Ligand binder design. Structure first.
Ligand SMILES: O=C1NC(=O)[C@@]2(N1)O[C@H](COP(=O)(O)O)[C@@H](O)[C@H]2O
Ligand SMILES: O=C1NC(=O)[C@@]2(N1)O[C@H](COP(=O)(O)O)[C@@H](O)[C@H]2O
Ligand code: NA
Ligand code: NA
Lengths: 431, 431
């Protein structure tokens, strides 16, 4: 329909960016509704590689306005850095972007609290991106945080900023025994971008309701993935926002009765960055092969993605939590050449019990062992294939089995990192 | 349809409880999806008055299972107290209730932090219920909190509880200069109900998906109201959960594509408990009349609800944020006898600008003045009227004007506090 959601079905890095950039060809708006710059979406258009974080993946398209919904926690620092890079490449960011004055703000003290809490978690550290996302979300629900809107009044922004920092620095210095964050610096840094931000503000919910009445095509871009949802994820190894489809209404202001189609991105195999249960993790040659072939290295120490077999027990759970209406299989080609492929269809509980639904809290996962279904791999290359008929039987069978186990059709198939290396079986805007 | 949501369109106290108890006659399940015991829903069935908070309003009905979704922050203390009262009245609570092991826990230290933060807010205090709701929601998004699930392991519960309390008491004692909360007490108190809780646990999302496949009728009961939504509300004078319809998916685990009808409860006039902008507030005889007639006194100091004219600018905003499909007008009778009635149709900005959309942040509301539409009241009684034809023209006109301004039909009309003093024009389960 008009309103199509694009979220990750696993633990992030499913290939959301690419898919949004692809389908936005038909959208009037693309909307980010949760998370922050902890997200990293790489795009490759005809060879050119663009990496975004905070800015929505529809930015490289003209005649498509990008909106950062109130669900997004916003770092003006990161937003700046990200605007200049594209503005440099010749992308007219300032002209295609719009913000919601309801976005909380991530400031220096959040990144600091984030690092402090992680070092304090010690061995049980989460594996945070270190961008101050959780801290920002914490100030928000605690009703103490600043939001873009707060910048309309430079004078008040100052008064409020002082109280909040007073509280946080007390935490840091006295409790985490850490360096205090300089109030004046932050005040200055922020005040200097205050006018860039406030000028891109728009009442998003009103806008989204209008577009709904005109029939505009809206594409909501999710970040992270279903199993990192603060509620339904593998708490506490999870991100602090709702990554599931419900966060679209919550983080954008669009009534829930208005989501028309929910596209779940499904990477052909599993990965996980950070700590957390992963029943399907590989520590062998295959595990090695998937990483080298997937090229999931990270931006830095600790962002080297873990790999493993596609987990259908966990996917079926992303199916119900999101009322998915279609899957988009990405990275099918990373499996090329393997002798046999495998997919988890049940979990064997420590007590011998074989279940088909996933546990909730991370502790509840501690002893599950996957129960796979093994099937033949394929030697021929699937990389770059644009036609279905050009896919090897074994590959097509892998696809069909995913469709039988989950009950959801696979509508789009990505066969390469390029925007053009894709097969659109059924367009979400057409259903 | 099968899935009907019932949330408040204003600032809470619209009459949600009554309406849920009423319509659940046809539901298999009733689900709480956000908030805690800060909510207070009074029921009056054939004279008998039941006041609930944490337990869903479908509890007094047999053949209807009540579920407390993961969105609810849960106080085992309050749950207990609430179970015994009903169990005493003869209501078999333990047998009709089900919990989600994903609900965070509100423990002594949250109520303490809540009181401490409020006293520290000084003149800018929020007007919190003092039940530790915000603090509980803060531990959750900070990934440090305990959840019902944590109780499955008594031993671990202890280990985790210690770290969390260590952190909170440091805050209290050193920063809020307040009394520390005793770890051992809390450990003991909790451990003593641990087995009541864990025994009522159920995987709610899986359950809700099943019921969806069988066609069961599910009623989601919202707490508070649209304008107290942590995102879209009058921040910071707001509650710390998403009161808007999106919180249904987020707090229950039901895919958003599955909400069939959203019933917005609309009290015939406005009220607000706690601090916060209220453009339509009355400080005159009428203001006095609405309170005495409404009987919105509170449970204690500071719960005396503020009153004012129905605000259509603010209601139209609850309309888009929730994709409402019907209104339920309650307390129409409180207006009986008034000479003329009024409703806000626009806001006059300080700078003379007359807008039709509401501001976001509370500060953005500071100088708006309402622009009303005045119409004739009615002398005849509407209290207890069950038939539409028995309503006085002026009353019917008031109704129709609400329908023209908002574009949403008024499907149910409550004419008295009793479950039977209602007119069901169109049933949500029938649409
Ligand atoms: O963007 C993210 N992807 C994640 O997997 C991740 N964040 O979610 C968890 C919390 O990180 P953060 O709070 O920084 O988003 C970590 O696993 C982190 O790596
Ligand atoms: O249940 C509530 N109704 C409210 O209006 C209210 N809570 O929302 C605001 C925050 O309260 P709390 O965090 O306790 O829910 C206050 O106005 C409080 O009165
Ligand atoms: Na990524
Ligand atoms: Na109430």
């Amino acid at each position: 329909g008009n309103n199509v959601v694009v979220l990750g079905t696993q633990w992030g890095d499913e290939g959301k960016g690419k898919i949004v950039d692809l389908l936005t060809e038909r959208a009037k708006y693309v909307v980010r509704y949760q998370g922050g710059h902890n997200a990293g979406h790489t795009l490759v258009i005809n060879g050119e590689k663009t990496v975004l974080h905070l800015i929505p993946s529809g930015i490289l398209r003209e005649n498509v306005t990008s909106i950062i919904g109130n669900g997004v926690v916003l770092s003006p620092a990161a937003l700046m850095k990200e605007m200049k890079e594209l503005e440099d490449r010749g992308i007219p960011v300032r002209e295609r972007l719009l913000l919601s004055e309801a976005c909380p703000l991530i400031l220096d003290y959040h990144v600091a609290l984030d690092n402090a809490r992680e070092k304090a978690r010690g061995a049980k550290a989460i594996g945070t991106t270190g961008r101050g996302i959780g801290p920002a979300y914490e100030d928000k629900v605690a009703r103490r945080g600043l939001r873009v809107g707060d910048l309309f009044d430079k004078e008040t922004f100052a008064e409020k900023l002082k109280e909040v920092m007073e509280y946080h620095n007390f935490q840091l210095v006295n409790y985490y025994k850490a360096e205090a964050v300089d109030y004046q610096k932050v005040l200055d840094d922020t005040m200097a971008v205050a006018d860039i931000l406030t000028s891109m503000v728009v009442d998003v919910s009103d806008l989204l309701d209008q577009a709904r009445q005109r029939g505009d095509f809206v594409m909501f871009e999710g970040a992270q993935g279903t199993l990192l949802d603060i509620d339904h994820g593998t708490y506490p190894y999870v991100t602090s926002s709702n990554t599931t489809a419900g966060g679209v209404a919550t983080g954008s202001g669009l009534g829930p009765r208005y989501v028309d189609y929910v596209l779940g991105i499904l990477k052909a195999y599993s990965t996980r960055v950070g700590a957390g249960p992963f029943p399907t993790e590989l520590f062998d040659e295959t595990g090695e092969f998937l990483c080298k072939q997937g090229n999931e290295f990270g931006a830095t120490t600790g962002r080297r993605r873990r790999t493993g077999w596609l987990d259908t027990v966990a996917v079926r759970r992303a199916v119900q939590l999101n009322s998915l209406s279609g899957f988009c299989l990405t990275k099918l080609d990373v499996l090329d050449g393997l002798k046999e492929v495998k997919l988890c269809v049940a979990y064997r509980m420590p007590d011998g019990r074989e279940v088909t639904t996933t546990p909730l809290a991370a502790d509840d996962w501690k002893g599950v062992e996957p129960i796979y279904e093994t099937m033949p791999g394929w030697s021929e290359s699937t990389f770059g294939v644009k036609d279905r008929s050009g896919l090897p039987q074994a590959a097509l069978n892998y696809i069909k089995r995913i469709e039988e186990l989950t009950g959801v059709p696979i509508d789009i198939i990505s066969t390469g990192p390029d925007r053009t290396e894709t097969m659109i079986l059924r367009d979400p805007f057409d259903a």
